[PDB]
Design a protein around this ligand. Structure first.
Ligand SMILES: CC(C)(C)c1ccc(-c2nc3c(NC(=O)[C@H](O)CO)cccc3c(=O)[nH]2)cc1
Lengths: 195, 198
């Protein structure tokens, strides 16, 4: 069930694990951030070990891999948010009802960390600290979004219930993805950083 | 694991199974419905076999059973809706983003009734062009609940100083619950569709 690179949780179901700087896992996540956010300062990176969220996400992944007849449904994306939302996300994941929604009423994830690093998203807290998640997202098969969507559009108007898995701003060169269901996104790392 | 009493679906992921009057499965739902809806008549009752919705719901049930202390977390409730919504609900379940505002709101979520008479109101089970009304019978993970409030977009915390440890659902009245509101996907499994008429 639980991934191998997680560390022991003494039979508990939720833990935030601060990563050791200079080790492979920390370097890998840092690199993905610094590709576009090298002018920022990383204070720490934490691994989110939430067993319930992981289980519900992996079930949805298995289902999407069956539905789409392929296994290229996952992307690693970024989500900046304010400090007041961090405890909720760690415990409960991403909730579209807490959403601003130009491509649909869902949760938004950025291809580039620099987009999530905007102060409108990763709002600096009273100490100047900014917060950004690295997220496993089941983008699956996607189409262009539009304002007012509550679910992705149907793949074909002849079967209105067979839906795209997510929407984007631009199908040829996406920079953001919107997902409309719980447990289509697993918050995997939390980056705390400053400008 | 899919229930062993379901029909074989030939590797398919979804199907609706028409029940036979006289079988206990049909009669128990009929009795539950007629307890408060004796003036209506049932056309048919279909068992909803949706493999993916069942799996995700059963995962949430197992998690709530773990988290809560030997609590009966699941109730069998009713949900009236319009014909236009039946194909989506059958396939994808109950989406709070599509829910209507209830005439007495205890939160912005999906509403489920204890009494079929409540879901039988035309405001919920809107008659279609042929006069058919539609009501789901739903397994709902009500869990541990409290009285809701109109402003809620998620269940409230049990403890104001631990805002992320939430009630599982809310109700109109904890002493005499008649409706429940849920705020998350896969917290309710549409198990039967009742088609009925006046
Ligand atoms: C609720 C508060 C704290 C105000 C908030 C607001 C926006 C985001 C947020 N938004 C994103 C986004 N959003 C848009 O492109 C437009 O809002 C759509 O019209 C695109 C790509 C990535 C992100 C992203 O990482 N976080 C997080 C939190």
């Amino acid at each position: 069930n639980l991934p191998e690179h997680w560390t022991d949780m003494n039979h508990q179901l939720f833990c935030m694990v601060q990563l050791e700087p200079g080790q492979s896992e920390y370097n890998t996540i840092k690199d993905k951030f610094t590709r576009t956010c090298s002018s920022y300062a990383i204070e720490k990176i934490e691994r989110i070990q939430n067993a319930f969220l992981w289980q519900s996400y992996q079930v949805k992944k298995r289902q999407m891999d069956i539905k789409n007849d392929h296994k290229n449904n996952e992307r690693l994306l970024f989500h900046g948010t304010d400090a007041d939302s961090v405890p909720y996300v760690n415990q409960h994941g991403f909730n579209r009802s807490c959403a601003a929604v130009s491509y649909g009423k869902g949760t938004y994830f950025a291809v580039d960390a620099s987009y999530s690093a905007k102060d409108t998203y990763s709002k600096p807290d009273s100490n100047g600290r900014k917060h950004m998640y690295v997220v496993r997202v089941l983008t699956g098969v996607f189409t262009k979004g539009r304002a007012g969507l509550v679910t992705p559009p149907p793949k074909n108007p002849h079967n209105p219930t067979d839906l795209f898995d997510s929407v984007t701003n631009n199908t040829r060169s996406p920079k953001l993805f919107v997902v409309f269901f719980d447990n289509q996104a697993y918050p995997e790392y939390l980056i705390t950083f400053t400008a």
